[PDB]
């Protein structure tokens with residue numbers, strides 16, 4: 001799928017987005033790819049952080065549904081008006097689809113200054129779309145209206161170091177292959193875990209390790225409430241109990257250096273002289289997921305290069321600085337960009353499963369690399385899922 005390879009732009013901490021056009025004549029907009037929601041929405045009125053926005057009055061194909069819509073996210077929220085219009089993806093399959101579109105009229109802490117995206121593409125299921133499950137999500141409309149296979153895959157590429165606005169604009173930020181899988185985006189084998197239920201892209205974690213050492217918690221604690229794959233979330237987010245235990249372990253593994261509590265809470269950056277970041281003192285983190293085969297599991301392992309996110313501390317500073325991107329949640333585990341930047345993730349909706357393979361663009365050093373390995377069968381499974 002050469003045509004779609006490299007169709008994403010973006011950065012760590014900012015958001016990965018794809019170019020789409022809406023209405024007639026086509027209006028071009030950068031749309032954030034978000035597997036943590038199911039609404040297709042675009043800025044539709046002026047906003048400080050928006051360089052452009054959808055102008056319904058200039059689209060001859062716009063259809064006003066005369067209904068309001070409200071969408072609150074873990075971070076940010078917005079309000080808008082529902083309609084439908086023709087939508088296309090310049091660097092995706094060659095099709096045009098009539099889709100539901102939330103025209104954003106008011107928002108709070110949703111749009112990000114300097115992000116370059118103006119809308120969001122909720123790729124999860126109807127069950128969680130607002131106002132309710134009757135508002136057909138975009139991917140669903142795409143599959144019903146075309147011959148595109150009911151599957152998409154994502155490769156989000158972090159850089160390992162900061163990028164200014166010009167570099168971010170002139171750089172490839174990943175690929176979103178619509179309807180298929182591109183072997184050039186990963187190495188090794190693709191391991192699949194079941195989509196537990198079709199609402200969020202829900203999965204079940206069966207074990208967690210920090211540098212091979214078992215966190216040793218009841219696996220229900222790992223999925224307490226739920227565990228999901230969310231490309232629209234920056235961090236690897238963990239339930240309070242798991243988070244406290246994981247952080248105590250990461251601290252113990254990296255104790256040759258002491259960091260303020262603010263670092264561990266993600267409130268302050270840590271910096272080292274240019275090129276001297278001590279990646280090796282930080283542990284790798286492994287999450288074991290249920291396999292498709294009964295009593296079988298596999299694990300995905302990330303490196304500190306995935307969980308210590310680069311941040312530019314000023315313009316002529318000779319320091320490499322980062323923020324700890326693992327934080328706590330009171331709404332289950334959220335495998336955000338920190339996990340996704342390490343793997344090629346296949347959302348196989350047709351077979352209700354998610355595949356993971358080491359990403360061809362994941363960041364690493366000469367000594368360690370991200371990994372996807374299995375199978376494991378000593379595993380004490382299911383009672384791991386929450387109810």
Ligand SMILES: CC(C)CNC(=O)[C@@H](NC[C@H](Cc1ccccc1)NC(=O)c1cc(C(=O)N[C@H](C)c2ccccc2)cc(N(C)S(C)(=O)=O)c1)[C@@H](C)O
Pocket residue numbers: 011012013014015016032034036037038071072073074075076109110111112120128230231232233234235236237327334336337
């Ligand atoms: C179904 C829907 C009504 C609710 N579902 C969501 O809220 C889900 N998350 C999807 C939203 C989508 C979104 C929200 C705001 C701006 C852009 C997209 N994402 C978040 O809620 C979310 C986004 C962000 C975030 O900054 N996302 C940006 C755009 C981003 C940067 C880098 C990579 C990917 C995304 C952060 C966090 N934090 C919780 S954190 C500090 O732990 O990572 C959460 C999930 C938490 O259930």
Ligand SMILES: NC(=O)[C@@H]1CCCN1
Pocket residue numbers: 010011012157158159163167168171172173174
């Ligand atoms: N995310 C990006 O901007 C990529 C990563 C390396 C340079 N381009």
